[PDB]
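Tutorial, part two.
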Amino acid sequence: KVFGRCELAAAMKRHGLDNYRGYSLGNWVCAAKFESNFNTQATNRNTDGSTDYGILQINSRWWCNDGRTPGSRNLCNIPCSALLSSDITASVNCAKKIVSDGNGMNAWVAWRNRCKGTDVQAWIRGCRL
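Running the prediction step on this input gives:
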């Protein structure tokens, strides 16, 4: 599923990402835009043998089980396929663990490179939330 901007924004707000650990909804929409281009099926291989899955590109080394990542811990207790669902519930619940893991949104390398310190409020413009 490719989400529209305000479509994703509404869903992320319903699941409680707005101001979660002090990060405005715009940070989360911006992160999704550049991690996944709002495509819930986005997958990207990393060179440690791990893969990033879904709307928020959640990593298979610590967070979900894809059954093919060496030294994998599945801290979100879900298969990585569940993070490619058209609904974002699992991806949000798991992202709440990751943002609480001692680096805030710095865990998202597209967020860090393209969102952090920017006018993130722009990402919820025209959304009726």
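The longest helix spans residues 25-36. In part three we will examine how such features are distributed along the chain.
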